[PDB]
Symmetry: C2
Subunit: 286 residues, 2 copies
């Protein structure tokens, strides 16, 4: 079994096309997460709206009639509700307004599309989102920058969230399931990127995008209960700490206190597969 | 030795963050190319301005003073002329004007930056390009759409070119070397994408970006003279054509006449390494035997 032999700081977020700038843990008011992009199992099964390639990540495609944008897949193929919560690659950033840069094949210019994901017109699961002033035509859009949610008024930017893909929060949209910390002092490890916009925004994901294409390619036939990893300095070969990767596609570690965890590690290290271990294998704290 | 076990249509161009839509050959007024992005050897050596990750591709970072933009690497690290023709990831699309979407950490809004790459103020090799109206501040920019070049006036978009990175076409900028068709009836194979803007623009590259991260990770210790590959349909397992990958990081095939080449192949196939062969190994024309 292998992970990419590439330093983390050379890789991309899997929730937006942004370089990885650090590792992190979630705030204390965040336990589980339910990201729809950046989801890939260790045997290579893509989950949620996750694409193989960053060229599809945090993008939309569709035709505006001036009132709504009717969505398709990025290549123009129809999207149907049975397929998922939104087309492949659709942004999954809850807890913010989006600003998507819209361009066209065969026309000049770009246009900023401002997206509040809270109203009942925002129903990408049914292939329809409000045009919010975007004129008639076919567009490809990519997330450019974010800002605080328009509703509820005065809400914080909270990128641990996903948007409401359905007409209401009660509508089933075929979300990929939530990921939970597995217990025994282990915390989920997130790969962070700086996101432009009027604040110090940091976007977490479960796996760098290049890990997803690697795992989707490798299609490992021999996944065990947990992969014991070392986070290694490439030059010195020094083991900077023990981590576990779980079959559902996430990493954990045991921090060495609130002041010393994966966020204190250099970001130019490489994760290296050591061996398959028990689900309950007890890690040495970072 | 391995290449990604992923269909081409799931992958990205390495000169802009765009899905791969086809394979193609060069125009008959292009024999060699000298792309600076999308360059990686089979043993994993990145060449030119090529980054590992698509998150750096066709991007700029720098500080405008209202007159010029002083460039750095995307992470803010200094860039110096000895390092290359431009910072890592900098766009390499010749034969067009660029329209780059500029955003800022800690600020609202985006701004379109319009770039004619022809004037003597466009000197990314020396870390400086004209601001062309972009206000003071630090920005990250990503290529968004392109249009015909402002100079020479009336010329067509030609993405087979690279821009002039120096103050003059005679200035040495440490460009990655040209790639030439190798002989034996073989043609260079390009991976194509559609680029937004006011025309039917076709962006070629030598390798999908995911192949570059794959090769850079793999760091193959045993590269031969050429890799013999099959282009395979995953479901049926059918061999749709023999190709060669050369150490410098490019693929070739032998077209089955003017009528039948890479452009006629479906784009949902997978390249699979077969064996190391001699540089002079003669391929069967695509689709034949
Ligand atoms: Ca698995
Ligand atoms: Ca110039
Ligand atoms: Mg790694
Ligand atoms: Mg392939």
């Amino acid at each position: 079994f292998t992970l990419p032999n590439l330093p983390l700081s050379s890789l991309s977020n899997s929730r937006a096309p942004l370089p990885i700038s650090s590792m992190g843990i979630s705030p204390d008011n965040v336990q589980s997460v339910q990201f729809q992009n950046g989801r890939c199992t260790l045997d290579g099964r893509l989950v949620g709206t996750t694409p193989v390639s960053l060229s599809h990540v945090a993008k939309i495609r569709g035709t505006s009639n001036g009132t709504v944008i009717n969505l398709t897949e990025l290549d123009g193929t129809p999207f149907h509700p049975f397929e998922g919560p939104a087309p492949i690659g659709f942004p999954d950033l809850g807890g913010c307004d989006w600003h998507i840069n819209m361009t066209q094949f065969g026309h000049s210019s770009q246009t900023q599309y401002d997206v509040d994901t809270t109203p009942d017109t925002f129903v990408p699961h049914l292939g329809s989102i409000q045009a919010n002033g975007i004129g008639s035509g076919n567009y490809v859009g990519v997330l450019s920058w974010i800002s605080p949610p328009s509703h509820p008024s005065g809400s914080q930017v909270d990128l641990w969230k996903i948007p409401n893909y359905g007409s209401s929060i009660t509508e089933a949209t075929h979300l990929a399931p939530s990921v939970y910390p597995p217990g025994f002092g282990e915390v989920l490890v997130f790969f962070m990127s700086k996101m432009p916009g009027p604040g110090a925004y940091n976007l977490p994901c479960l796996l760098p995008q290049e890990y997803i294409s690697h795992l989707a390619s490798e299609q490992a036939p021999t996944i065990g209960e947990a992969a014991l990893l070392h986070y290694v300095d490439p030059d010195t070969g020094r083991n900077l700490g023990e981590f576990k990767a779980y079959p559902d596609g996430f990493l954990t570690c045991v921090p060495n206190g609130a002041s010393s965890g994966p966020q204190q590690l250099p970001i130019n290290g490489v994760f290296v597969f050591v061996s398959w271990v028990s689900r309950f294998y007890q890690l040495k704290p970072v």
